[PDB]
RNA sequence: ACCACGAUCAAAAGGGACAAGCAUCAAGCACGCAGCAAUGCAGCUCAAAACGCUUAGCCUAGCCACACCCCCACGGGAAACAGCAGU
């Protein structure tokens, strides 16, 4: 879910006395009257507070994963509307690849933080396929038949025994 | 006997490592104090600008 | 005299855990190229009995030969886990670490 | 030593070390931080290397 | 650069394109027959599979699709 | 190439030698069918 | 040793190792595992070359394979020099 539009900008959230200003100033300094990048910054800060142990450290692998996850969500939201944007499709796919690489590094280095990142961001880590080969019509049909024939043989052997 | 000697060598290296790490900790404390002071100074002025 | 399995002790990385109580482990040895006289890694797959199913994909494990194979391809058992994937304990200092960085300082103890 | 399985690991721990696994199940840990490669070779020769006399007998 | 190789490529391609135009009708029949034989070979491979497996006929509900007919 | 590439490809594989008109034999027997001259 | 204690030698079985060319042979199609069993899981091999085709006796104090053919030889074809000399 997006932060409420009434939320203050990241840059005006700690200035002393921000609660004693007029409603007009509050609107002027909120997410309602800003571009989407400020909303993404607030999302990033929220995720950093929720997940990482030290939210001030932005150079850590977890922080980079959070930032790229927010960027990926932005790209997906863009592409729902812009179906023919090939450049942004490329950017989304490349960002997904980079996040998978960082997740692999995190899993190999810090499993607890890896689990926290996976739960907090709703990411499902998957292992890459072992072989990259075309699944053409002949192979697909043959594999389906082979699975069917194995099932039939299993049924026949169960009947026999 | 050779395994005992190897373990003794490991222990000696561990003591040397503890000494080196203690020195590193001290230097890191000094540098971190300086950087924290600089960070606080920067944040104060940036907050006053946004005020 | 103690076992009929050729490889008595081997170290590998777990590459599969989809079999019940069996870890598929990849072991790499160094083989000399006769022409280039350079050592290259040669890989071999081993099935190791994991009674407690405590092995995860990617961890470095030690396999010990069974006295006799318990199955067609299972000739070993999991002696220990040398490195738990993402949960390495520095053998030299005994402290948790994430890669080259200490998670807990050695001085703390 | 053609029949000894040598395996390398990179940037997994804060410091470098060697570990030998023996047929008896004993494990020998050799810390090598701050040591030159010649020093490491001499140390492993001393602790787990056949002496010259055994080689001459063979 | 050698322009003669580019010229020879031009001549060979132009000569090739003339042949396919001249024998276009013959080629289509040959391709259709080849695809028919291809489909037959694929079916025989599938039949060999279920025959070796033990089944006397195909698995129930299985029908070998035509994966080479346009 | 690099050492990795040379290891992957392995030793060069010289093709089998092509057999000539005598099929790799010193001499052959033959029956004359027709005689003529060529330019 | 012969009475065996065991040595020597060496089968069957189990583990490991091992020719060449073709990837225009790229997928194999049941090739795994756990349980005393019942049964359960859906797995196993493979571009670090599986599966397949073709070629070739080999790593020579020697070794392997074959002994007319049907790999084998109850059985069948049929009547056997790839022992020496010889045709
Ligand atoms: N073929 C694979 O699926 C695969 C899997 C793991 C690693 N690799 C590595 O990729 C390199 C190329 O291998 P090749 O000469 O046998 O492929 P190749 O060019 O000869 O084509 C064979 C198949 O491998 C795929 N392939 C090709 N290049 C690949 C790559 N870099 N990574 C993954 N798949 C690739 C192709 O899609 C094709 O289906 C090798 O170093 C190999 O170790 C390949
Ligand atoms: K025979
Ligand atoms: Mg035998
Ligand atoms: Mg004869
Ligand atoms: Mg015979
Ligand atoms: Mg004779």
The token pair at A7 is 């939320």
State the chains in contact with F (3 or more Cβ–Cβ pairs under 8 Å).
C
Give the number of other Cβ atoms within 10 Å of residue C65's Cβ.
19
The gap from C-alpha C1 to its chain's centroid, in whole angstroms, comes to 24
In angstroms, rounded to a whole number, what is the distance separating the alpha carbons of residues D14 and B13? 15
Q: Which residues contact D13 (CB under 8 A, 6 or more apart)?
A: C88, C90, C91, C92, C97, C100
What are the angstrom distances between the C-alpha of A155 and each of A158, E52, E55? 5, 16, 11
Q: Kindly report the protein residue whose alpha carbon is nearest to atom 29 of ligand 1.
A: A132
- In this complex, the residue of B2, B5, B13 whose CB is nearest that of residue D31 is B13
Q: Tell me how far apart the alpha carbons of residues E62 and B29 are, in angstroms, rounded to a whole number.
A: 74
Report chain G positions within 7 A of protein CB atoms. Answer: 13-17, 20-22, 26-35, 39-48
Q: Which residue of B has its CA nearest to A16?
A: B51
Q: How far apart are CA C85 and CA A110, in angstroms?
A: 8
Q: Tokens in use for F20?
A: 């000539």
d(CA D35, CA D56): 30
Least Cα distance to C41 among C17, C14, C63, C12 occurs for: C12
Q: Which two tokens stand for residue C59?
A: 């961890």
* Technique behind the model: cryo-EM
What is the rounded end-to-end Cα distance, in angstroms, of chain C?
A: 45
Residues 6+ apart with CB under 8 A from C26: C12, C13, C14, C15, C43, C44, C45, C46
Rounded distance, CA A108 to CA A102, Å? 10
Which of A132, A134, A136, A139, when mutated, tests ligand 1's pocket best, judged by the most ligand atoms within 8 Å of its CB?
A132
Long-range contacts of A72-81, Cβ-Cβ distance < 8 Å, separation of 24 or more: A72/A96, A72/A99, A73/A43, A74/A36, A74/A40
Main-chain dihedrals φ then ψ at residue C102, nearest 5 degrees: -80, 130
Indicate the domain borders of chain E: 1-70
- Bridge partners of residue C23, in order along the sequence: C48
What residues have CB less than 8 Å from A45, skipping those under 6 apart? A10, A55
Neighbours of A60 (CB within 10 A): 16
Residue C36's closest CA among F1, F7, F2?
A: F7
Q: What are phi and psi of D55, to 5 degrees?
A: -65, -40
Question: Going by DSSP bridges, is the β-strand pair C60-65/C74-83 parallel, antiparallel, or unpaired?
Answer: antiparallel
Q: How many of the other CB atoms lie within 10 Å of CB of A121? A: 21
For strands C60-65 and C39-49, give the pairing. unpaired
How far, in Å, CA of E70 to CA of E45, rounded? 21
Q: Which helix H or strand E contains D28, and what residues bound it?
A: strand D27-31
* CB contacts < 8 A (C, F): 9
Residue A142 contacts residue E43 (beta carbons within 8 Å): no
Helices B2-50 & D37-48, crossing angle to 10 degrees? Answer: 140
C15 touches strand G (CB under 7 A): no
């Amino acid at each position: 879910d997006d932060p409420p539009p009434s939320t203050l900008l990241k840059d005006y959230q700690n200035v002393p006395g921000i609660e004693k200003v007029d409603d007009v100033v509050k609107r002027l300094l909120s997410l309602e009257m800003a571009n989407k990048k400020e909303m993404l910054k607030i999302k990033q800060e929220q995720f950093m507070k929720k997940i990482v142990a030290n939210p001030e450290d932005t150079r850590s692998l977890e922080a980079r994963i959070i930032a790229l996850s927010v960027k990926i969500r932005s790209y997906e939201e863009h592409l729902e509307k812009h179906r023919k944007d090939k450049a942004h499709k490329r950017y989304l796919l490349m960002s997904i690849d980079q996040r998978k690489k960082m997740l692999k590094n995190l899993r190999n280095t810090n499993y607890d933080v890896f689990e926290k990142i996976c739960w907090g961001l709703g990411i499902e880590y998957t292992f890459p396929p072992l072989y990259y080969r075309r699944a053409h019509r002949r192979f697909v049909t043959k594999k389906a038949l082979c699975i069917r024939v194995f099932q039939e043989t299993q049924k026949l052997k169960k009947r026999r025994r | 006997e050779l395994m005992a000697w190897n373990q003794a060598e490991n222990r000696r290296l561990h003591e040397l490592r503890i000494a080196r790490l203690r020195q590193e900790e001290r230097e890191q404390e000094q540098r971190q104090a300086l950087e924290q002071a600089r960070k606080a100074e920067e944040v104060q002025a940036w907050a006053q600008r946004k005020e | 005299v103690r076992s009929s399995v050729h490889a008595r002790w081997i170290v590998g990385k777990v590459i599969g855990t989809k079999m019940q109580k069996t870890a598929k482990v990849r072991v790499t040895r160094l083989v000399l190229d006769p022409y280039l006289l350079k050592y290259f890694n040669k890989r071999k797959t081993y099935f190791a009995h994991d009674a407690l199913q405590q092995c995860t994909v990617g961890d470095i494990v030690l396999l010990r030969a069974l006295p006799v194979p318990r199955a067609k391809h299972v000739k070993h058992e999991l002696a220990e886990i040398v490195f738990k994937v993402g949960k390495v304990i520095d053998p030299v200092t005994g402290k948790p670490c994430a890669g080259t960085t200490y998670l807990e300082s050695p001085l703390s103890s | 030593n053609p029949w000894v399985q040598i395996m390398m690991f990179k940037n997994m721990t804060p410091s470098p070390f060697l570990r030998f696994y023996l047929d008896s199940g004993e494990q020998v840990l050799v810390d090598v931080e701050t040591k030159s490669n010649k020093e490491i070779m001499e140390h492993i020769r001393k602790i787990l290397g056949k002496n010259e006399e055994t080689l001459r007998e063979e | 650069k050698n322009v003669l190789k580019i010229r020879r490529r031009k001549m060979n391609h132009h000569k090739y394109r003339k042949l396919v135009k001249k024998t276009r009708f013959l080629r289509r029949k040959v391709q259709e027959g080849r695809l028919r034989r291809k489909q037959i070979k694929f079916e025989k491979d599938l039949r060999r599979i279920w025959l070796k497996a033990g089944l006397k006929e195909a698995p129930e509900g299985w029908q070998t699709p035509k994966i080479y007919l346009r | 190439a690099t050492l990795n590439q040379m290891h992957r490809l392995g030793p060069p594989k010289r093709p089998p030698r092509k057999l000539g008109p005598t099929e790799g034999r010193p001499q052959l027997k033959g029956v004359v069918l027709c005689t003529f001259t060529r330019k």
